[PDB]
Amino acid sequence: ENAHTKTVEEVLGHFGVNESTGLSLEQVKKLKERWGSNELELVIEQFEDLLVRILLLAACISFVLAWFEEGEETITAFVEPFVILLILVANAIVGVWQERNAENAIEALKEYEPEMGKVYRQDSVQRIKAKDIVPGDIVEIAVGDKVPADIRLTSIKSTTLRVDQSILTGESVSVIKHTDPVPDPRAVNQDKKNMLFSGTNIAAGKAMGVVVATGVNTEIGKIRDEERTPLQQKLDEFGEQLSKVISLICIAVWIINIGHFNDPVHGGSWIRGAIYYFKIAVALAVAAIPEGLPAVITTCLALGTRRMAKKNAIVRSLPSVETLGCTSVICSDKTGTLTTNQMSVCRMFILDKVEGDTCSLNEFTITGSTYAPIGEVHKDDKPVKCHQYDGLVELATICALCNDSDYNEAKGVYEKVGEATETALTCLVEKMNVFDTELKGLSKIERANACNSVIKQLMKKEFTLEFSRDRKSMSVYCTPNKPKMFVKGAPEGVIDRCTHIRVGSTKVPMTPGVKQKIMSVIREWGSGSDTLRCLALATHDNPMRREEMNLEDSANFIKYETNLTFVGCVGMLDPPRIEVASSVKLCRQAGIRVIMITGDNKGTAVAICRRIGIFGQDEDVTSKAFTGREFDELNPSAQREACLNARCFARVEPSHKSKIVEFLQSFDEITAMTGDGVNDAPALKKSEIGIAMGSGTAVAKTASEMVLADDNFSTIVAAVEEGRAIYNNMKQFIRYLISSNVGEVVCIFLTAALGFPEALIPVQLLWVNLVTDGLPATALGFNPPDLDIMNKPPRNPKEPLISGWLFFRYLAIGCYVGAATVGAAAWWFIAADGGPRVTFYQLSHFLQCKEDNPDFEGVDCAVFESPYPMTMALSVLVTIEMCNALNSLSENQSLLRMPPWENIWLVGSICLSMSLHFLILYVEPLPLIFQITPLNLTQWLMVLKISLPVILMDETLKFVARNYLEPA
Numbered sequence: 017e018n019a020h021t022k023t024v025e026e027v028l029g030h031f032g033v034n035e036s037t038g039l040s041l042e043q044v045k046k047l048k049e050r051w052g053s054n055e056l057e058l059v060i061e062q063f064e065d066l067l068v069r070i071l072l073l074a075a076c077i078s079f080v081l082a083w084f085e086e087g088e089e090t091i092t093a094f095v096e097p098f099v100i101l102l103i104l105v106a107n108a109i110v111g112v113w114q115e116r117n118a119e120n121a122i123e124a125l126k127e128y129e130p131e132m133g134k135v136y137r138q139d140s141v142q143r144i145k146a147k148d149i150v151p152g153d154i155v156e157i158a159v160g161d162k163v164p165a166d167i168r169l170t171s172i173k174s175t176t177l178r179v180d181q182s183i184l185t186g187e188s189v190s191v192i193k194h195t196d197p198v199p200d201p202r203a204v205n206q207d208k209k210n211m212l213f214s215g216t217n218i219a220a221g222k223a224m225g226v227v228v229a230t231g232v233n234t235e236i237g238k239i240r241d242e243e244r245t246p247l248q249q250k251l252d253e254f255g256e257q258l259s260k261v262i263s264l265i266c267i268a269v270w271i272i273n274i275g276h277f278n279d280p281v282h283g284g285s286w287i288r289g290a291i292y293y294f295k296i297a298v299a300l301a302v303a304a305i306p307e308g309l310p311a312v313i314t315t316c317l318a319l320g321t322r323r324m325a326k327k328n329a330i331v332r333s334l335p336s337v338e339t340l341g342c343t344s345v346i347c348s349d350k351t352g353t354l355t356t357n358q359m360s361v362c363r364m365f366i367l368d369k370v371e372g373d374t375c376s377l378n379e380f381t382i383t384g385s386t387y388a389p390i391g392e393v394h395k396d397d398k399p400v401k402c403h404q405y406d407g408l409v410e411l412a413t414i415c416a417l418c419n420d421s422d423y424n425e426a427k428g429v430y431e432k433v434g435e436a437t438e439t440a441l442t443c444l445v446e447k448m449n450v451f452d453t454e455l456k457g458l459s460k461i462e463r464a465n466a467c468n469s470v471i472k473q474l475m476k477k478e479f480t481l482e483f484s485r486d487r488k489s490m491s492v493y494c495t496p497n498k499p500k501m502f503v504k505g506a507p508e509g510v511i512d513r514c515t516h517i518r519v520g521s522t523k524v525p526m527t528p529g530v531k532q533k534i535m536s537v538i539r540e541w542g543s544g545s546d547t548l549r550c551l552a553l554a555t556h557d558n559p560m561r562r563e564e565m566n567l568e569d570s571a572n573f574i575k576y577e578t579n580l581t582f583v584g585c586v587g588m589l590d591p592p593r594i595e596v597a598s599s600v601k602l603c604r605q606a607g608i609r610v611i612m613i614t615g616d617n618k619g620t621a622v623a624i625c626r627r628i629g630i631f632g633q634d635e636d637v638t639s640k641a642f643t644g645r646e647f648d649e650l651n652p653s654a655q656r657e658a659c660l661n662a663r664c665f666a667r668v669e670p671s672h673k674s675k676i677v678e679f680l681q682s683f684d685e686i687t688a689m690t691g692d693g694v695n696d697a698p699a700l701k702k703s704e705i706g707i708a709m710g711s712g713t714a715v716a717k718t719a720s721e722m723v724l725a726d727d728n729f730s731t732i733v734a735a736v737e738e739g740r741a742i743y744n745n746m747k748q749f750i751r752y753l754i755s756s757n758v759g760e761v762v763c764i765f766l767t768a769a770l771g772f773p774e775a776l777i778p779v780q781l782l783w784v785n786l787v788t789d790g791l792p793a794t795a796l797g798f799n800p801p802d803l804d805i806m807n808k809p810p811r812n813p814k815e816p817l818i819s820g821w822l823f824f825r826y827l828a829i830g831c832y833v834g835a836a837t838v839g840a841a842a843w844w845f846i847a848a849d850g851g852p853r854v855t856f857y858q859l860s861h862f863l864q865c866k867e868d869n870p871d872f873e874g875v876d877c878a879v880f881e882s883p884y885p886m887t888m889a890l891s892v893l894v895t896i897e898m899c900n901a902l903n904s905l906s907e908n909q910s911l912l913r914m915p916p917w918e919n920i921w922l923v924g925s926i927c928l929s930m931s932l933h934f935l936i937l938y939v940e941p942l943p944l945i946f947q948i949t950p951l952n953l954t955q956w957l958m959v960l961k962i963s964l965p966v967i968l969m970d971e972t973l974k975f976v977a978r979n980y981l982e983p984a
């Protein structure tokens with residue numbers, strides 16, 4: 017169906033629905049059975065990055081050398097392409113495997129928190145899943161809700177209705193809707209002002225309509241078909257900078273070896289020698305270039321996102337992970353975010369006697385802490401019947417009629433309809449029973465709305481003035497049923513607008529001494545151990561005429577609140593979440609300065625920061641907290657200075673929340689806002705990272721880079737930890753390959769400078785890449801979090817990636833790894849059991865091999881080109897670089913406190929590589945391409961003896977790191 021133009025009567029008759037009741041269970045069934053619910057090569061390809069493009073060229077030019085039918089050896093040339101291609105597809109499959117597991121955790125998280133919608137059906141308004149909405153349902157949504165499906169407006173409960181069409185049309189400015197018909201069918205969607213389209217957000221107003229499209233038939237579903245954190249741009253620069261350094265050395269090695277082209281090992285020709293050293297340069301390039309750098313990125317990000325899904329935290333922005341790591345300060349909302357978001361009225365007071373500055377007191381306490389309509393009114397450990405007091409009856413009238421706020425039969429609990437703060441005013445009226453009406457004969461769903469239904473019948477609701485966050489009050493005007501204005505709002509804001517007080521039923525003007533009697537108790541409830549929210553309850557006994565008043569401007573409603581009469585004030589208890597006290601404590605240990613940006617009273621906010629940990633109980637607050645009205649009354653010199661020191665902000669308007677973030681960003685402070693309502697939407701947008709609770713508004717979820725299905729605030733601390741756990745893993749990844757592959761460069765330069773036969777065959781240089789730089793390097797993405805991961809200071813994006821001291825340890829480790837594999841091959845010539853005994857100053861020039869060269873006779877003939885030194889160099893090179901992989905588990909922590917088995921993915925990786933190293937040397941057909949199996953008894957005891965002290969070379973510098981930890 018495409019019924020859009022015609023009036024509301026014909027579209028309701030098309031579906032055969034009633035606006036009051038709605039569809040039934042069997043009518044939704046058929047409609048659900050007719051339209052339905054309401055809702056590989058590129059995957060494998062990780063090869064798009066620049067570094068992968070190099071080995072693909074190196075694998076092709078190596079494939080061309082094998083096409084010449086010689087390759088210096090018919091079987092050896094065939095191995096060079098496979099060694100290069102195996103490491104590329106291996107790192108690709110592992111990275112896709114983690115993206116495979118990452119997509120499996122996101123889909124399971126979608127089932128954990130399905131989108132919700134507010135509907136009217138035959139079985140009060142109820143909320144169900146968004147996919148169960150069928151065409152014909154009656155849907156009523158308010159400010160902050162996301163439009164679930166295409167809806168034809170049938171009624172508007174406000175003076176205006178604004179809808180944000182930024183997702184569908186691209187218009188950032190909201191447009192005003194209406195229930196009037198439109199003339200033309202095929203007009204553009206921007207001219208359709210009587211339709212609510214899915215995906216759009218409600219900017220202002222509260223409307224109710226009928227659904228005309230679901231699932232695929234949705235208007236936004238028609239078009240829906242068809243870089244990360246400059247660190248990666250820096251990594252793309254790092255990959256480009258490191259490649260040019262390697263490219264400069266490889267072309268230099270080919271020039272250094274220009275004099276060795278004519279050696280007899282190559283065949284006695286410059287062409288025969290240039291090709292062999294051209295393969296040396298290519299084998300050195302492929303070995304030195306990091307292969308799994310694009311793979312460790314996907315590995316760490318797919319590991320982190322899958323760890324966040326385990327803790328039930330949605331990540332809507334992929335790059336927003338490591339931005340959390342560099343977060344300097346975090347500022348979060350209080351209500352719903354730092355509290356358990358459970359409102360219930362526990363205390364209440366009115367005025368008893370007033371004379372001059374002397375005023376008396378009375379305190380009414382409410383038992384029970386739930387949303388259930390059961391409780392007892394008590395005063396001084398004694399029950400109180402609230403029928404005698406006319407002030408409590410008028411107080412109950414304010415709590416009931418100025419509010420628009422259902423028993424769950426499945427779980428057997430009462431759930432709130434609307435906001436939680438207003439819901440506590442509803443259950444408060446039910447507990448009073450001011451008119452002494454019998455409540456036992458009614459059912460549970462009838463008991464929860466029993467006392468409010470009686471007041472609704474006694475006093476008719478004429479019209480309502482919407483709540484605004486700037487004037488901090490909600491005004492309603494009532495009239496007895498057969499043909500009074502009373503307002504509730506902020507205590508410090510309404511009492512100033514109250515010029516009268518009603519002692520019992522007698523109204524007398526406001527006394528400045530009695531005004532302070534009320535505020536002192538409000539502060540004691542706010543700053544006490546209870547930390548209660550207070551709501552001033554007033555009534556305007558000189559109500560203005562209806563049409564004499566204007567409802568177009570919400571800011572003009574302050575004139576309508578002049579000459580109020582104070583009735584009373586109620587207290588509400590919303591305990592903080594049991595994990596928030598530890599969250600700020602770990603944020604203090606991580607250098608993150610926690611800020612509380614809320615709109616409630618400062619007396620309530622400063623008492624929280626003392627309980628939670630933002631402020632110490634022994635700490636005093638001199639200039640570390642300000643109200644919104646005090647924040648604007650500070651000189652510009654102290655205006656910015658307060659943003660750096662103050663860890664709490666109260667009574668701020670939604671326009672001031674976005675500014676506080678802007679003042680922090682001016683000092684280059686990385687911020688993170690956590691909010692639940694549309695109040696925080698300008699702040700969530702403006703901030704670097706936005707956080708919205710799972711029970712928060714959908715507008716806050718859209719602007720937030722994270723959504724917490726489990727609204728526990730402890731996830732924020734673990735979220736910053738994971739962004740800091742991907743950073744150090746990328747450090748250990750670069751820490752491993754650089755410090756190891758520099759020794760590969762030191763190896764080749766040392767053999768030429770010392771005067772020994774060159775270290776390894778180009779195939780022997782490509783093999784160590786497949787073993788040392790492959791799956792052992794990718795397994796570093798699975799490293800466990802470091803011991804000091806949440807105590808070390810945060811990251812500054814202005815500073816370079818590699819520190820000055822870290823560049824030193826890259827060389828210090830590279831000097832030993834390079835000299836160990838050369839000294840191993842040197843050991844075979846100097847003193848070897850199975851080898852010759854030829855020292856005589858290492859016979860620095862080995863080029864003299866025949867015949868019985870004078871003054872170097874030699875015990876035997878020329879034994880160069882023998883595999884025993886070459887394999888000795890590779891046996892240690894593979895072994896010493898596996899011992900270096902154990903050093904990359906932590907940054908500065910000793911290995912006796914970070915055991916090697918903390919990373920299970922690496923231990924099994926080294927055993928697979930060492931077995932692959934052993935499978936290669938010991939299986940008879942393989943040592944033709946490779947050269948010769950070494951000795952088992954004596955050599956491996958020497959390989960282990962040489963490859964072991966590299967662990968000592970690393971832990972002694974961690975001792976220096978444990979002595980003092982500075983970048984340098």
Ligand SMILES: Nc1ncnc2c1ncn2[C@@H]1O[C@H](COP(=O)(O)OP(=O)(O)CP(=O)(O)O)[C@@H](O)[C@H]1O
Nearest residue numbers: 349350351483485488489490504505506615616617
């Ligand atoms: N619906 C309502 N009617 C009357 N007064 C309200 C009200 N909602 C809040 N107030 C009061 O107005 C003052 C302003 O509160 P505001 O709504 O601007 O921030 P908040 O802290 O309540 C939202 P958050 O959950 O994000 O912390 C509060 O002190 C509150 O007591």
Ligand SMILES: [Ca+2]
Nearest residue numbers: 303304305789
């Ligand atoms: Ca490599």
Ligand SMILES: [Ca+2]
Nearest residue numbers: 349351352692
């Ligand atoms: Ca909130």
Ligand SMILES: [Ca+2]
Nearest residue numbers: 784785788789
């Ligand atoms: Ca290597």
Ligand SMILES: [K+]
Nearest residue numbers: 700701703704
């Ligand atoms: K943002």
